[PDB]
Symmetry: D2
Subunit: 312 residues, 4 copies
């Protein structure tokens, strides 16, 4: 039995850094995820049962854990317009609860986060965050579903943990997670078909046709509407997830810094691909503000290759 | 604070509802363990098989259900004045992803035929939180599982599904197998809608029917699994999926019909695992589907 | 089969038992948070909380018109029911700061009354596990709180206290304040028995008596110079425990040897000395004083 | 700010040049085992009654598995194992000596029990031998216990005071709730099994008679008596309220009952670090003792420093 704390300490002592600040960032993250998971599980009872808003609570929990780490200098959070700078080194960028529109339904939602190391000559500015995707040291998400899962990369493949609620421990259940190169599942909001251009529309028409590499069967469709849950299914089963540009969202909806970046990092480390609508590698992009958006297609390498060929 | 046992005594069979809520708490805990069921010992089955076992054991031990239909037993179960028909875990293909799944059940007083002859229906939706949604015959009530206390607590009393909401829930990978009436209605929902600020419907499809329908109850909208060339009688089982959801849906102020627009509660199954197509949800959006056919 | 407490109480007012078991689960969870109740918020006093939890559940039951609570001086009557409840919501208050076993104790009446008149009695013992021990009139049953499911499951059906067992449970710090009869009895249990007794005294009466139920032995809190009428409250501590003990096959008397359940409180907070436990060991005590 | 055990340990260890993470991994193994044991003990009879669709043996197994999985505990002493346990596939950094569930005789009653553990650093260049544990108590590097009662508590020393943590079951995290715990020097509570009065010599018997007499030191009140019968629970109360705990030699237990290596030693280290004292019946410092075998027993008196000073005065006069 391998728990996340031992997994992390063992990884970090490869670098003579078992007690370094990175271990405290991970400790802060896993504490925040267990707290958010429990709070999300209580659902309406949060406001209803006393001692004798849910996305706001998630934000507060995450900010508090990060500050109490003592070593995160800088934090971007989706509901804070401005860069958060703490009094007393890593930068964390996060959507504490993504999929908020699913909360009232009690379906799956999640937390998503990228981690940067402060630039050498830095006391904590937007320069430590407005960077190329390739400078992330780590990325992770917690998927709050019928079970809670933590999926992480430190630059060396992907590992998945399940939360043991009897013990409050993340236990390694999917080591060296690999996304299958081929799987006929696609995940997109076809309600936005009206607003897509012809290239995007015709690709989505293609996946509904019989597929030779799928026994002449068309793709199957799934769309929870919580990006973390859809992409988690994509990691485990294979397939495609997309949120393209459209007339109402000319640059997508995923936030580049703390949603498209971390998911692209995880996806590449699992053997998948992640690109924007133009076929550019997501990790090659650089945000201009902390809340830039990007379109995204990510998932099974074979299926992304099909999208890339279509764009031609 | 109204807990479910209090709700059930005040509304007074009570044993049958007790056995059901017990099974749901047990199944919900097991599902939250996910892979840890086979990895972590005290110091190798499948979740769907365990869920069936938990549910059948609870039913059998109630002492009061003589006859049982479960999605995964081919044959009728005989063990007492009541019968229950159940899918103990629906959305099995979502279990490995840890997304929302659920249990669905219809209850008959004593043997398992016309849909209007259910005395009660309910589901448990195992998502990021666990919910129980229940009808006794007079409206719908929704409960949230408090794991601190191990009690379902009334949180959505007199639940009413909004009459209008532009959300549709369907597997559009099956487009190739739909007839033109179905295909064109789905084409229609993607057009601008005057009743949605000139915007198309938004699409959602978890792929676990109980989760998608639970969202439909709380948000409004449309859920469909129509007939198609590979599933000519649909996918949902009439006896223990379509019937109970239809009964819940009508008691909440919505509609539930098959692909021909026949009311689901009017149907009668010829064998315990009969399938049926279904369109259910907001009354106004189902009226749009009815006008379309 | 797994038998839950709801199944048990319907297979056998039901609303009263359900309000009680709800309160017990809520108090158990709260006590398990201990200091965290005051240090951890939604984003990052215990005896008072337990009282409020119990009173709120009793009021919300609808069925309870009148309640006696150890932490309420005056009788309390609600607006809307045919039953009275008398309770110590957390007994063993002085052990809370140590995190050790404590308990809730309650008696139920239909409609200041004889102990024969209680309809039912129960306690919840919050220890390293949480237990509920109950009687309605025909023997006693013990349940364990399964925290995975939030259900009391029957674990001790038809509980029977062994008639003899050499364990005694008493605060010998009060030896200075006892009369000669009590002093010499306690001196006797330390002599070899055809080995002497073993001593155990958690200091939470519910825990000490729960152990006595399961292993056998004697629990006592006699009159002393500082507490001439004992310390246990007759109405909601001595009564319910005596009811359960007799229904389990044991005995419960006061220092004068009189049956606890024959007594009648004259005020809701009256106190009584008590000796309860294995019938053989209580017999030995009776011989000693009588 | 909420302080969790892992942050507390990591912030402590990163002060040290030579912290490799191995000690943090020992604490992680222990806190994992404590949470698992606490959950198992809360199940009680249900472990044998409720399946998928005895406790002290389970506790021992949980503990051995966690210590082995740490990767860095080379040597393990456990009460229930007759022999010294070696994990040859682990690095030779630490030895752990523990009673995984002490107070077993109380488990059937559902009252408080606990885990007690001492931690030693292996001797330089040791492969892992019984020389690594058969040592003077003053050589422990750390000591802790987990008290499983109506709440679960972890009490710990790393050699500079004592800190107490409460287990948050919603999170599965030990949270710092009693920083820099100090046991009162004076407090009129005594914890002893007076059922054993027959088997004590006259010096012990007369001391226990003294504590039942009026103390001018307590406004002419006697001591109050408490004795759960689980040593970890009674000693935990002693830490938090003050008082005395004792299990002396008696004719049936000529060397007492606590095990020196993994019970008297760690409790004595915690007691001294909280400001109390811990001696045997003869008044010898518990931590000055050396076990001759891993399961040696010792008499013990421990608690508030002023109450132990009274016991020491008594045995000095009685000579
Ligand atoms: Mg968000
Ligand atoms: Mg977001
Ligand atoms: Mg199924
Ligand atoms: Mg099904
Ligand atoms: Mg009280
Ligand atoms: Mg009391
Ligand atoms: Mg032991
Ligand atoms: Mg021991």
């Amino acid at each position: 039995i391998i728990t996340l704390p031992r997994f992390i300490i063992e990884h970090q002592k490869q670098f003579k850094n078992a007690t370094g600040d990175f271990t405290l960032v991970l400790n802060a993250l896993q504490f925040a995820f267990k707290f958010v998971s429990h709070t999300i599980r209580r659902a309406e009872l949060v406001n209803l049962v006393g001692l004798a808003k849910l996305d706001v609570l998630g934000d507060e929990i995450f900010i508090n854990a990060m500050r109490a780490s003592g070593i995160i200098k800088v934090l971007v959070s989706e509901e804070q317009e401005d860069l958060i700078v703490f009094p007393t080194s890593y930068a964390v960028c996060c959507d504490p609860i993504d999929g908020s529109s699913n909360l009232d339904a009690g379906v799956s939602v999640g937390t998503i986060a990228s981690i940067f190391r402060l630039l050498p000559d830095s006391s904590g500015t937007i320069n430590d965050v407005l960077r190329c995707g390739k400078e992330m040291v780590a990325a992770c998400y917690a998927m709050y579903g019928s079970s809670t899962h933590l999926v992480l990369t430190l630059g060396d493949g992907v590992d998945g943990f399940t939360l043991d609620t009897n013990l409050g421990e993340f236990i390694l259940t999917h080591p060296n997670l690999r996304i299958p190169p081929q799987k006929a599942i696609y995940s997109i909001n076809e309600g936005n078909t009206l607003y897509w251009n012809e290239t995007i529309r015709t690709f989505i028409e293609k996946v509904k046709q019989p597929q030779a590499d799928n026994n002449n069967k068309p793709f199957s469709a799934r769309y929870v509407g919580s990006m973390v849950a859809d992409v988690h299914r994509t990691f485990l089963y294979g397939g495609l997830f997309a949120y393209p540009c459209d007339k109402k969202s000319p640059n997508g909806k995923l936030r580049l810094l703390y949603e498209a970046f971390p998911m692209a990092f995880l996806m590449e480390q699992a053997g998948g691909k992640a690109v924007n609508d133009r076929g550019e590698r997501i990790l090659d992009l650089v945000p201009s503000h902390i809340h830039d958006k990007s379109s995204i297609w990510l998932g099974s390498s074979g299926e992304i290759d099909k999208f890339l060929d279509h764009i031609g």
